[PDB]
UniProtKB/Swiss-Prot annotation:
Compartments where located: Cytoplasm, Perinuclear region; Nucleus
Stretch of the intact protein here: 1 to 83 of 1128
Protein family (similarity comment): Belongs to the ASPP family.
Designated gene of the protein: TP53BP2
Recorded superkingdom: Eukaryota
Annotated organism of origin: Homo sapiens
The name this protein goes by in its record: Apoptosis-stimulating of p53 protein 2
Function of the protein: Regulator that plays a central role in regulation of apoptosis and cell growth via its interactions with proteins such as TP53. Regulates TP53 by enhancing the DNA binding and transactivation function of TP53 on the promoters of proapoptotic genes in vivo. Inhibits the ability of NAE1 to conjugate NEDD8 to CUL1, and thereby decreases NAE1 ability to induce apoptosis. Impedes cell cycle progression at G2/M. Its apoptosis-stimulating activity is inhibited by its interaction with DDX42.
Coiled-coil ranges per UniProt: none
UniProt comment concerning the protein's domains: The ankyrin repeats and the SH3 domain are required for a specific interactions with TP53.
Induction data: Following DNA damage induced by UV irradiation. Down-regulated by wild-type, but not mutant, p53/TP53.
Tissue: Widely expressed. Expressed in spleen, thymus, prostate, testis, ovary, small intestine, colon and peripheral blood leukocyte. Reduced expression in breast carcinomas expressing a wild-type TP53 protein. Overexpressed in lung cancer cell lines.
Subunit and partners: Interacts with P53/TP53; the interaction promotes pro-apoptotic activity. Interacts with BCL2. Interacts with protein phosphatase 1. Interacts with RELA NF-kappa-B subunit. This interaction probably prevents the activation of apoptosis, possibly by preventing its interaction with TP53. Interacts with APC2 and NAE1. Interacts with DDX42 (via the C-terminus); the interaction is not inhibited by TP53BP2 ubiquitination and is independent of p53/TP53.
Amino acid sequence: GGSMMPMFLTVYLSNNEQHFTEVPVTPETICRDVVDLCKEPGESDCHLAEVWCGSERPVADNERMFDVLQRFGSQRNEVRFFLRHE
């Protein structure tokens, strides 16, 4: 197969609650996956969001995958990633 030590996050892109882009990132890259895939009007003063079980918070583009997954709590695979473009 192709098991990977690191983990991944499911990002949301486009006006829809069903289109998302998931990605496996190591603690090196940050919210580049969320913005790069969930981009459109060009990365200009944009931020990533984290909502899980009603727990929504503003996530910075410099938040490492797990880094962001460590703020939620025990349920690391219960959060959602979403691209917010003002």
